[PDB]
Each structure stands twice: as C-alpha cells, then as structure tokens.
From a paper:
[name] ([name]) is a class I AARS that has two active sites separated by a distance of 30 Å, a synthetic site that aminoacylates tRNALeu, and an editing site that ensures the fidelity of translation by a proofreading mechanism. The resulting covalent adduct traps the 3′ end of tRNALeu in the editing site in a nonproductive complex, inhibiting leucylation and thereby protein synthesis.
The most potent analogs were compounds with halogen substitutions at position 4, bromo (compound 11), chloro (compound 4), and fluoro (compound 6) substitutions, which improved MIC values more than 5-fold over those compound 1. We therefore decided to measure the direct binding of the compounds to the editing domain using isothermal titration calorimetry (ITC) and found that the 4-Cl and 4-Br substitutions significantly enhanced the affinity of the compounds for the [name] [name] editing domain. This increased affinity is due to a significant gain in the enthalpic contribution (3.1 to 4.4 kcal mol−1), which is consistent with additional favorable interactions being established by the halogen atoms in the editing site. These results confirmed the importance of the size and nature of the substitution at position 4 and agreed well with the in vitro activities and thermodynamic analyses. Therefore, we tested them in a GKO mouse model of acute TB, which showed that all three compounds were very efficacious, with racemate compound 11 having efficacy similar to that of isoniazid.
Residue numbers in the entry: 313 to 322, 330 to 401, 404 to 513
C-alpha cells in the first residue's frame, strides 16, 4: 500500500490506502470519530445549502460531532458487528492528484487504532465507500474500467480512466506511477 497526505483547504491528513492507483477517484475523506485532528478541522458553521443528511440534525458541526460521538457510545458489540452513518466536519481537504476539494467526514466504519485512523474514500472501487456514498449522496467516480459502478463498487484489475497521467495503465502499473508521483512531490510513501 501507500500513505498519502491530503492538505486542509483552510494541517495535513495522512491516509493509508491499499489502492493508491485510485487516487483520482477519491471523492471524500473519512476520519475515525476519535481521530486527533477532528476537533481542529471542525468548521464553526455549515456551508449554505448543505445536504441535511450530512449534519446529523446538529445546528453546527461541533454540536453534530459531539452528538455523533455520544450516540455511537450507545452502540453495543451487536451493532459494531452488523448501515453507514457519519457526519460532515463542515470542512474540505485537497485531493493531491486532481487538486479538487473533497469534504471531510467522521464515520464509525473507520477505526481509530488502525493504519493512520483515516482513509481516502473511493466509492467507485471500495464497496464500503460505495455504500456510504450512496447513503449520503456523495460523488461516485469510475477510475478503473472493468465493472459497472452503477451496480456496485468494481474491486478488480482493469485499466485506468479519468486519471490524467495514469490513463490506460493497468492497476499494478498505476500503483507504481502514483507512488512515484507522491514521492516526487514529497506527499506520500509506499508502505507494507
Ligand atoms: C482492504 C481493501 O481496501 C481497499 C479496497 C479498495 C479501495 Br479503492 C481502497 C482505498 C479506498 N477506500 O483505500 B483502501 O481502504 C483503506 C485501506 O485501503 C484498507 C487497508 O486495509 P488492510 O490494512 O486490511 O489491508 O482498508 C481501509 N482502511 C485503512 N485504514 C482504515 C481504518 N483505520 N479503518 C477502516 N478502514 C481502513 C481500499
């Protein structure tokens, strides 16, 4: 895999990914609810026109985040074993591949004590992210041709699309190219 940095649009969030080849399809970030950077990244107010599904019914991001943290504490092993929930922080990070802003969420599907405690979400190609994006109304972008992203996440090998300098490469070739690019920029590393 790889670790990669996403810059705050307004602080770097380090993610661990086994699919760095899919970087151009990362449409949002997810931090564990406990992640140390959450309180720092929480906006004072919601953006105008925010999707109500993203706000946990909280009047401000800080109120919604406290409510989410309190609510998920009422979950038992049963719930944690078994739907995608979560909350928008009101803030954005920059995707280092395409320079596009992506919204930052917390969600309990991301575990605090594993990897870096944060992920890049690629709904096109990770079913967990696909499910979350469908529930929240987040963009789902195909970057690996081979499947049908309107049906389910496509998790297999294929050919890079919608990925600029990666276009036409296989998954293994694209992983090497993007790690090379991350290293040249000082923004990522290959990691076991
Ligand atoms: C396993 C298939 O994963 C993927 C499959 C397809 C795609 Br496209 C991707 C991309 C976009 N999501 O990145 B994937 O998700 C991250 C990381 O790589 C992967 C690390 O899991 P492995 O340590 O067991 O190998 O799990 C996710 N992960 C990393 N840290 C995590 C954490 N703390 N909590 C929950 N999930 C985490 C991943």
């Amino acid at each position: 895999g790889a670790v990669a940095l996403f810059s705050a649009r307004a602080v770097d969030i380090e993610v661990f990914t086994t699919r760095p080849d899919t970087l151009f399809g990362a449409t949002y970030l997810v931090l564990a609810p406990e992640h140390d950077l959450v309180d720092e990244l929480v906006a004072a107010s919601w953006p105008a026109g925010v999707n109500p599904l993203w706000t946990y019914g909280g009047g401000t991001p800080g109120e919604a985040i406290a409510a989410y943290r309190r609510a998920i504490a009422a979950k038992s092993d049963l719930e944690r074993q078994e739907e995608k929930t979560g909350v928008f922080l009101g803030s954005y990070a920059i995707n280092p591949a395409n320079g596009e802003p992506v919204p930052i969420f917390i969600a309990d599907y991301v575990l605090a004590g594993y990897g870096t405690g944060a992920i890049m979400a690629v709904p096109g190609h990770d079913q967990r992210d696909w499910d979350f994006a469908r529930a929240f109304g987040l963009p789902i972008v195909e970057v690996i041709a081979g499947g049908n992203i309107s049906e389910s996440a496509y998790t297999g090998d294929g050919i890079l699309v919608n990925s600029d300098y990666l276009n036409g490469m296989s998954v293994p070739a694209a992983k090497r190219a993007i790690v090379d690019r991350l290293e040249s920029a000082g923004r990522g590393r290959a990691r076991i």
